[PDB]
Amino acid sequence: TDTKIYFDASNLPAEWGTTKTVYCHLYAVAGDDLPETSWQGKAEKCKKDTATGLYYFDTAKLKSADGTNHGGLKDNADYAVIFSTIDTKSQSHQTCNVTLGKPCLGDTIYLTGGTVENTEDSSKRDFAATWKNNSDNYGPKAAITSLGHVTEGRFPIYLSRAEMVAQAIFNWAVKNPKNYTPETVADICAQVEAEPMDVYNAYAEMYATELADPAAYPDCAPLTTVATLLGVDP
Ligand SMILES: OC[C@H]1O[C@H](O[C@H]2[C@H](O)[C@@H](O)[C@@H](O[C@H]3[C@H](O)[C@@H](O)[C@@H](O)O[C@@H]3CO)O[C@@H]2CO)[C@H](O)[C@@H](O)[C@@H]1O
Ligand SMILES: [Cl-]
Ligand SMILES: [Zn+2]
């Protein structure tokens, strides 16, 4: 019945300093059109439970694009969540990505110890975190990073391995070509168990609209680049 998820901000590492504000970055990976919230913006702000000291975020208050209530998490969808803070020195801290499903509603994310490569920023490591009661089926989300590394954790159910690699190439091949080399893309395929030609076909279908208008979408690698990175001849 509880549509809230909770964050244990007690006994944080010294690096986190004194928590001032807590934020929840909850997003769909596959099977939902959930709008993404601005990182550490108003829509992400978590309330403090003054009784328990836990912070919480109500998934029942997630908004759709038309500003109405989204009607909660969907059953046949992959979600991921990050809890973050701004400390009394205005410095940001965050958990890694943790997989999220309906069984996790009413449960608490806590820091496990250890850090992991930030997905966006090679200068940063996030803090390993998982669910208190749902770690059997949910936990750290395996992510393809800005460097083309595949982080520790679980893979999605409703996003194919080929689609995951296609999305990484779409995200990073133009932005970070010194990392997104043919060697790196071969390594990604090996780590996520995707067939390169499946990645090429997935990319071509997924990003057809952007591929048709390079002038408008310059961060979308053209098919010729994607074929070269995957070592395939289409
Ligand atoms: O929205 C989906 C997206 O969410 C997560 O990305 C967030 C990062 O985890 C978070 O750190 C932040 O990234 C910023 C860096 O902290 C900052 O140093 C600098 O590099 O800018 C980054 C933003 O470009 O915000 C993003 C969300 O925008 C998740 O990790 C991703 O895998 C996921 O795709
Ligand atoms: Cl890792
Ligand atoms: Zn790495």
Author numbering: 34 to 267
From the publication, what sentences describe this entry?
We solved the crystal structure of Sas20d1 via sulfur single-wavelength anomalous dispersion (SAD) phasing (2.1 Å, Rw = 17.7%, Rf = 21.4%) and then used this as a model to determine the structure with maltotriose (1.5 Å, Rw = 17.5%, Rf = 19.7%). Sas20d1 has a canonical β-sandwich CBM fold at the N terminus with a bundle of three α-helices at the C terminus, with maltotriose accommodated between these features. Maltotriose is primarily bound at the β-sandwich surface of Sas20d1 via the aromatic platform created by Y60 and W72. The nonreducing end O4 is directed toward the small solvent-filled cavity between the β-sandwich and the α-helical bundle and does not directly interact with the protein. The O2 of Glc1 is positioned 2.6 and 2.9 Å away from the side chains of T152 and N130, respectively. At the reducing end, Glc3 has little direct interaction with the protein, with O2 positioned 3.0 and 2.7 Å away from the side chains of K157 and D154, respectively. In the maltotriose-bound structure, the helices move toward the ligand-binding site with a maximum displacement of ∼8 Å, although no part of this bundle directly interacts with maltotriose in our structure. Not surprisingly, the pocket of the native structure has an area of ∼783 Å2 and volume of ∼1350 Å3, whereas this space constricts to ∼521 Å2 and a volume of ∼848 Å3 in the maltotriose-bound structure.
Ruminococcus bromii is a keystone species in the human gut that has the rare ability to degrade dietary resistant starch (RS). Starch adherence system protein 20 (Sas20) is one of the more abundant proteins assembled within amylosomes, but little could be predicted about its molecular features based on amino acid sequence. Here, we performed a structure–function analysis of Sas20 and determined that it features two discrete starch-binding domains separated by a flexible linker.
